[PDB]
Amino acid sequence: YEGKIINIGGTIIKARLPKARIGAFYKIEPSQRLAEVIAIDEDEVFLLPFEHVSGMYCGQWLSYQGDEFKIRVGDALLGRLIDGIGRPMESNIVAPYLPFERSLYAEPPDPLLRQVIDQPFILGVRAIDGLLTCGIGQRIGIFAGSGVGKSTLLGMICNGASADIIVLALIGERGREVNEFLALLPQSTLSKCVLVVTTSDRPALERMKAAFTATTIAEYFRDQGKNVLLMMDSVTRYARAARDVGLASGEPDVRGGFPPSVFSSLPKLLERAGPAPKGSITAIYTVLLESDNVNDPIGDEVRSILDGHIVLTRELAEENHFPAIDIGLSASRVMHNVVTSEHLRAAAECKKLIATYKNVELLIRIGEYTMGQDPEADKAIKNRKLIQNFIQQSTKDISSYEKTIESLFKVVA
Amino acid sequence: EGKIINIGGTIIKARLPKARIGAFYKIEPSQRLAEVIAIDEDEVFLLPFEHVSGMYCGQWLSYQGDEFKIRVGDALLGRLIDGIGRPMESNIVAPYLPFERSLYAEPPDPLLRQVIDQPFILGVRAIDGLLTCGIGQRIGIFAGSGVGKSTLLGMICNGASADIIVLALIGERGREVNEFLALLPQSTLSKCVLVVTTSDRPALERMKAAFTATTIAEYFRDQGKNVLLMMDSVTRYARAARDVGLASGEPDVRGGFPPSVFSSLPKLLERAGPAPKGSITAIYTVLLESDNVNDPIGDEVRSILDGHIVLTRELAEENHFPAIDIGLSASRVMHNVVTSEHLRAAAECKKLIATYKNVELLIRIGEYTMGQDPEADKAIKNRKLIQNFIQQSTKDISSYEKTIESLFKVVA
Amino acid sequence: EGKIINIGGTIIKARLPKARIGAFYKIEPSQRLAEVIAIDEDEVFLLPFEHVSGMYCGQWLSYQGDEFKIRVGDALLGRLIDGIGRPMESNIVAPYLPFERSLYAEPPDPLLRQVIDQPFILGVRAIDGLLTCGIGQRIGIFAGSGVGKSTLLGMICNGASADIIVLALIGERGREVNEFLALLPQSTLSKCVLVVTTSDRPALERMKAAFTATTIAEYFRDQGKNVLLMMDSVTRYARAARDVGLASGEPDVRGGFPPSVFSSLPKLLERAGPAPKGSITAIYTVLLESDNVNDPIGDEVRSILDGHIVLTRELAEENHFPAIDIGLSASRVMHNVVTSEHLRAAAECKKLIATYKNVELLIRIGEYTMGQDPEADKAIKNRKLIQNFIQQSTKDISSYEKTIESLFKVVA
Amino acid sequence: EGKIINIGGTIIKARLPKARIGAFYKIEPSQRLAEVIAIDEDEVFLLPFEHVSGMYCGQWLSYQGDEFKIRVGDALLGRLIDGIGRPMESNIVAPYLPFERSLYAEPPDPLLRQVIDQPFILGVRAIDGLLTCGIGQRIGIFAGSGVGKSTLLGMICNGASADIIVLALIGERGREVNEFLALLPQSTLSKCVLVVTTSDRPALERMKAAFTATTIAEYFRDQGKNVLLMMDSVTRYARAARDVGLASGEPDVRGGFPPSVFSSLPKLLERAGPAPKGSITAIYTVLLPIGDEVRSILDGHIVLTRELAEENHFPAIDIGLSASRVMHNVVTSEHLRAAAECKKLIATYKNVELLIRIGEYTMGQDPEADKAIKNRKLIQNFIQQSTKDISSYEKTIESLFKVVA
Ligand SMILES: Nc1ncnc2c1ncn2[C@@H]1O[C@H](COP(=O)(O)OP(=O)(O)O)[C@@H](O)[C@H]1O
Ligand SMILES: Nc1ncnc2c1ncn2[C@@H]1O[C@H](COP(=O)(O)OP(=O)(O)O)[C@@H](O)[C@H]1O
Ligand SMILES: Nc1ncnc2c1ncn2[C@@H]1O[C@H](COP(=O)(O)OP(=O)(O)O)[C@@H](O)[C@H]1O
Ligand SMILES: [Mg+2]
Ligand SMILES: [Mg+2]
Numbered sequence A: 001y002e003g004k005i006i007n008i009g010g011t012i013i014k015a016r017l018p019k020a021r022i023g024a025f026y027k028i029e030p031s032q033r034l035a036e037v038i039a040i041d042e043d044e045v046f047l048l049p050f051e052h053v054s055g056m057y058c059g060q061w062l063s064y065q066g067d068e069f070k071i072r073v074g075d076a077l078l079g080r081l082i083d084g085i086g087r088p089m090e091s092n093i094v095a096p097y098l099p100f101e102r103s104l105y106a107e108p109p110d111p112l113l114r115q116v117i118d119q120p121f122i123l124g125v126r127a128i129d130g131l132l133t134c135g136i137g138q139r140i141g142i143f144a145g146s147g148v149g150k151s152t153l154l155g156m157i158c159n160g161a162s163a164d165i166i167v168l169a170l171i172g173e174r175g176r177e178v179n180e181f182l183a184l185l186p187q188s189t190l191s192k193c194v195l196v197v198t199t200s201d202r203p204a205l206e207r208m209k210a211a212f213t214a215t216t217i218a219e220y221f222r223d224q225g226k227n228v229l230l231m232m233d234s235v236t237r238y239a240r241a242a243r244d245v246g247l248a249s250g251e252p253d254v255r256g257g258f259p260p261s262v263f264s265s266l267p268k269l270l271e272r273a274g275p276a277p278k279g280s281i282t283a284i285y286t287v288l289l290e291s292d293n294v295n296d297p298i299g300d301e302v303r304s305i306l307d308g309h310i311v312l313t314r315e316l317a318e319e320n321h322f323p324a325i326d327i328g329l330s331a332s333r334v335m336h337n338v339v340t341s342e343h344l345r346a347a348a349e350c351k352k353l354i355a356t357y358k359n360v361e362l363l364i365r366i367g368e369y370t371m372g373q374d375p376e377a378d379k380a381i382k383n384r385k386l387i388q389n390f391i392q393q394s395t396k397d398i399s400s401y402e403k404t405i406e407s408l409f410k411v412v413a
Numbered sequence B, C: 001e002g003k004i005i006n007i008g009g010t011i012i013k014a015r016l017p018k019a020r021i022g023a024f025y026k027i028e029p030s031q032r033l034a035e036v037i038a039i040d041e042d043e044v045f046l047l048p049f050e051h052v053s054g055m056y057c058g059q060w061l062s063y064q065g066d067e068f069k070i071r072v073g074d075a076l077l078g079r080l081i082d083g084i085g086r087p088m089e090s091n092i093v094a095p096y097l098p099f100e101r102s103l104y105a106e107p108p109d110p111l112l113r114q115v116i117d118q119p120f121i122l123g124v125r126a127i128d129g130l131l132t133c134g135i136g137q138r139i140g141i142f143a144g145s146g147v148g149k150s151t152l153l154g155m156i157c158n159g160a161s162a163d164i165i166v167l168a169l170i171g172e173r174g175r176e177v178n179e180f181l182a183l184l185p186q187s188t189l190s191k192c193v194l195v196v197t198t199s200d201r202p203a204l205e206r207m208k209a210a211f212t213a214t215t216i217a218e219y220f221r222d223q224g225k226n227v228l229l230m231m232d233s234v235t236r237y238a239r240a241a242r243d244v245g246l247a248s249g250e251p252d253v254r255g256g257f258p259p260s261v262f263s264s265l266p267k268l269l270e271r272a273g274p275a276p277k278g279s280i281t282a283i284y285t286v287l288l289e290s291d292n293v294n295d296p297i298g299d300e301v302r303s304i305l306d307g308h309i310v311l312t313r314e315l316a317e318e319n320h321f322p323a324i325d326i327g328l329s330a331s332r333v334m335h336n337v338v339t340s341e342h343l344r345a346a347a348e349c350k351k352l353i354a355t356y357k358n359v360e361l362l363i364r365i366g367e368y369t370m371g372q373d374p375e376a377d378k379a380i381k382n383r384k385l386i387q388n389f390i391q392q393s394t395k396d397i398s399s400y401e402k403t404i405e406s407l408f409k410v411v412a
Numbered sequence D: 001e002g003k004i005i006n007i008g009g010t011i012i013k014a015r016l017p018k019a020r021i022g023a024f025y026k027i028e029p030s031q032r033l034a035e036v037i038a039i040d041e042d043e044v045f046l047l048p049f050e051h052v053s054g055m056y057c058g059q060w061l062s063y064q065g066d067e068f069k070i071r072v073g074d075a076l077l078g079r080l081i082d083g084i085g086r087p088m089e090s091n092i093v094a095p096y097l098p099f100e101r102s103l104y105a106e107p108p109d110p111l112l113r114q115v116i117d118q119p120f121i122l123g124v125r126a127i128d129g130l131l132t133c134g135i136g137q138r139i140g141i142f143a144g145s146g147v148g149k150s151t152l153l154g155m156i157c158n159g160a161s162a163d164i165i166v167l168a169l170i171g172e173r174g175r176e177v178n179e180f181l182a183l184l185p186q187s188t189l190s191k192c193v194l195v196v197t198t199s200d201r202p203a204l205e206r207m208k209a210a211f212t213a214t215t216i217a218e219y220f221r222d223q224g225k226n227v228l229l230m231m232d233s234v235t236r237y238a239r240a241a242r243d244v245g246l247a248s249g250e251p252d253v254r255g256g257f258p259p260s261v262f263s264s265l266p267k268l269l270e271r272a273g274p275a276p277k278g279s280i281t282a283i284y285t286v287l288l289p290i291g292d293e294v295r296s297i298l299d300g301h302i303v304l305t306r307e308l309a310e311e312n313h314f315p316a317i318d319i320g321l322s323a324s325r326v327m328h329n330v331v332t333s334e335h336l337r338a339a340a341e342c343k344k345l346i347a348t349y350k351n352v353e354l355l356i357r358i359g360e361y362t363m364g365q366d367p368e369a370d371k372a373i374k375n376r377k378l379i380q381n382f383i384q385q386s387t388k389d390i391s392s393y394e395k396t397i398e399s400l401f402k403v404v405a
């Protein structure tokens, strides 16, 4: 009715319709599918459809629907599954009464009202609680390569941690995993859990906006005054989808593909989850790397945005050392605030012993290390299988925070 | 309908007013086809089905059909199919197929997948004892060229047991078609559908042949059966999609590949798994652009599939066949499949292999004197048992009980 | 005075005939400002101050200013300012800033700069005992991600003795503005100006916060007092200017960066320093792309800046904090400042650290007979005194006399 | 004389007919100027020196020239000069300058370069006792950061037997020009004519500073005077001409440098040699990619090292790996062989100090290292002195000949 699609191909369509506000979404008039305006030219507009692009033609019409795409949240979406658009997954249900329409692109809190975080957040993994330590309110990434440890460790965290609300986004991952995550969490956890599931099958728009849907639901349950744990599996799938859309919209390449829109819109997503006046969002994001190099474009940028990074390495997964986290290469930017100095000194000595043995281990496997001459290296070896039975852990085993730090004191000295 | 104005060599472009994208057109005098891949307000980009030589400007295009749907039915069992769905063996009568299916369908709904917990016996002791497969798991075989990908699919054709075996041979040798028919017995070839396009064919017919194999496997899944899909070199699909997408004017995001091969590979690989009725267990051969596993296609297909078996060239040079590197390999579904005792025995055998790989260069140089480590002497002592457990000949298959009891005898 | 013709991601384009550069316009339906960054002879490139929410074609523009100016004055202390210039705390009453200044001034005359002779007491034992800073020196702190740039500015800013501190937090997490105010006591918060912009803010606030901080520092310099300016990740300025200029029709040159970044960064980064009345002393945190050596924006900042502290994460992996690599870092302005015996003690224990970094191998390998290398014998005996002099705690600040006394007893 | 088409950040495009590459044009309302890098059939890509803000569509460009030449005369001795040529300060008034010459002059071909004679005394006693240098010889100094090369340059300006001394502080920092001029006397400044430019200044005039200083030194070469040229940090000329080159548009070849700097640096360095009018002793400093290309292109490298400068042994030069290639054509055979035997008397100490760090080395048969141990301190106070310690040429000769005893 308003315009005509005049260019079909790739991820974006292009239309001819004047006076289009940017970000408004338009329905394809005979064929019930709709598309969001991402950019405008002097008369022609770039649109990104919500579904696949097959079956279209030149001069196909476009109707006007709304100024902004908004999702509809409420308190009646706990224990239920949502896609990236906002509509529910399951159809054996009656769909709930969600009363509050919320926009999808909001603001972070005032930087003066973001308090300092000084309470520990316990995950149940002995390594990430003893050596590193999370805090109630921070956001922390799990940086690994392909098929190393990210999902499993995130399942161990979901099984071990406990918040008032749990919002779990599975964006751009395999569809076989939505029943594994539903199997490894109990009904006492499922009663406070919202899944936002976008499979890797889906278009670029759903796989790009599922992260914002999960962040919007998490901040809705934050504004009621509760501590909500957000867990977002592969924020890099958002980064890939935004790369595809931004390159199809005609933007350059900076730092290995990845237009400036990606590095501009990652902080608009990641700054929305932290401490707040009412409640706080503790966030745990997993990051896939383009090799096992930690110095990726997206790996380095999301490492410079987040408040803690947990680096998992493949050469500790070749050795059946699970969870495969590299202690020397991973850090936790809030553990000097959330815990006493005695735990801090013990964790520092355990990190120093791990790095000392890794500095020595090469000249043990070629038979040149001589015992008794270096006092720091010897104590790095005499405790080696005493520190490692602390640092590696089974999947179905959760630990308490007390015997964790008691094992740490027993392991270091 | 319209006329052709450019011919480049991979894609052509034409003056077609208001063509549906995806609809296939016909070159009018010369009996060839093409399909629409992009539209530019009066000028469509077309990908021809056959070779491009002979065309001229202003050559006409006739219309037929809104999409290229293949013709499928129950009478495909025991016969060979072209990549776009023709019967290849022309010495026999054409089969009667009642149904039409388009090549691009949807995966099953994610809440209807029912996490897999039954084993799938392959016959190779290394992907039965140490790695284990599931009914519904899609597996990858990652190697360099010449390392043994096709030998191992030949080993697991005559050892595995499904209802319908759907074997795609896309992008591979024409000489292979008969050698894969020399491994299949008559009780197995009477239930096998073999979709083969070779490396000579145009880029479309190597692109749209994995989708043909998946559509035939989905038709045989939806009847209530168990399908064993196996593709040979899915990276040949990835390279056909690469040079078509780069001819179509698209940027180069990673290692030479457009983003339209990274967005179109999950909507191929995710259609092969568990289902509300039936199942497809799929095995994909993946060739790596060097011996490095961090090839972009190797990395992306490792991040999509449910288990990877990396074969190295060091073990192919050391005459360790099959050349499965155990530390680099994994199987996601094994902890739901095997018992706790079998999982413990598998983990301890893998730790023995890693311990010997630690002490190997130290004993090769000559520093290892017997007696310091308790695990290194265990590795040296069980070395020969582990080696003749992992190493297996081509004409040998094991049953699952003999595999697990030999695992228990080897591990301790 | 013109219509907007297209909206990009970061950029606006309009038809403003004979418009100047720097002339900022506001959008008539929507109250928000935008300044001109390029001309294309009828068609200008503007950069907006905010996001692009509803931006229809043909939206009008109205002339507001020929250049953008900020309100400065002496009644700015103890406050928080954003990159634009307006106060960021809203519960407080708005102050009275008397004067206005443009953000683009020129560095002082190089024949009228003073001579740096007296030290700037910094607080950390390594950058006082080994790399001493003078009053008027521009040093930079070079590291990768999360290696400890912001923690070292916390240690400096805690134990700083300057008459007025301007702290620029450019393009970093909103969380840490309260963590910097948690280690500013009231005696140094009553005379500090925080120019803070967060990483989610639009492109030119993140591009102009450095100019706002240097403008405020030059104002309080021209009053006549010495002032400490500390920028946190001027690399965020550099890649904000990269994303602005590179999307305005300007070519990649060395890292994705246009030539305009390399034209506008040595003018910003040099208008600090000594002066005929007053002196800005500046500490620039620099983020590096990789941990490599061929960084197109780290190398030339290293070249045009007199003194640099290099933090390497290979010392942050053995938990050696602060991770200062004393061999890779230098201070061109310390031989003019400290006494000669201070130079001898600093050079001697740098020599001891450099000796023990490779005598350490032939201690572990059992090849070191005592006495054959006496200097190494002096670098093994005093290893512990050095490694308590170098790394210190975050809350462990120390005065200058204790640092030089402990330096002398470490070297002796 | 031409309207400005558009502004591309650092590139101006104009609509003006018939201009040559390198012609510099004039922004008339603001008094700024900008030179031509490329022409189209009627439009012209040129690039500004200064900042580009304040410019609009339709500003005029006054012609005022066709190539840039510097107004150079005899009265520039003792004045501060920009890389373009205008003075630095406004307290002094610009004197009479009759002549002007362009910045380009072709060097003679290398097949017929002259013989070197006539020892040229620099003032540091270490090299003119050990690594001497003639009049027309051009010398490269390879020093580091924090090695004390600025005092070395100030003390080879102070005590040189040259009537004119020309130095180009090309790309220096803000403080470092006063840091350098604080250690030059007034008797030296009344002999100097010196070009300064800072990293504030645009890369275009930061690369034309080298040609300006070379051109002024060629002017004082033609008046029958022995003249010394100094160019401090040739590498900063290299990065400035790099920024001009790939700012105009050119892909790089080696390191990050375009081949334009590899065509311009032998052209800039191959000139300024032994002319029959009384010639021009060039001293060019390079810090430690193109140091290979510089070290293979001029005769004589002097190496200053941090491993020697960590002690109090100034000037921080090591004779064991630096040598000026022309000494037999300069100094006599007695002085040459005595200097070379003192060089190998120093070089055998470092192969025997490490063997007397351990307790093994004795006397009895080693006639070259037993002499270094006794006659060490005369060596080690011959090859070092302070900043304002001058040692004339007719003292270092007999001092070196009583060092060899
Ligand atoms: N902590 C662990 N313990 C045992 N096995 C693990 C562990 N982490 C990963 N694995 C194995 O490695 C494979 C990859 O795990 P997963 O976390 O799914 O990888 P990704 O991080 O790519 O999702 C799985 O199939 C699993 O069997
Ligand atoms: N398990 C095995 N037993 C014996 N020979 C093998 C085995 N695997 C590979 N080979 C040898 O290595 C070569 C590569 O096998 P093939 O499967 O054809 O490579 P590709 O995986 O590239 O198709 C073959 O020629 C074969 O002889
Ligand atoms: N001086 C120090 N002492 C102890 N830990 C430190 C020190 N500096 C940095 N760290 C650790 O390293 C990490 C990086 O700190 P930070 O200063 O935020 O790095 P950056 O600001 O450069 O990203 C922190 O999580 C912190 O725990
Ligand atoms: Mg996963
Ligand atoms: Mg094969």
Ligand SMILES: [Mg+2]
Residues within 6 Å of the ligand: C149, C150, C151, C172
């Ligand atoms: Mg920081």
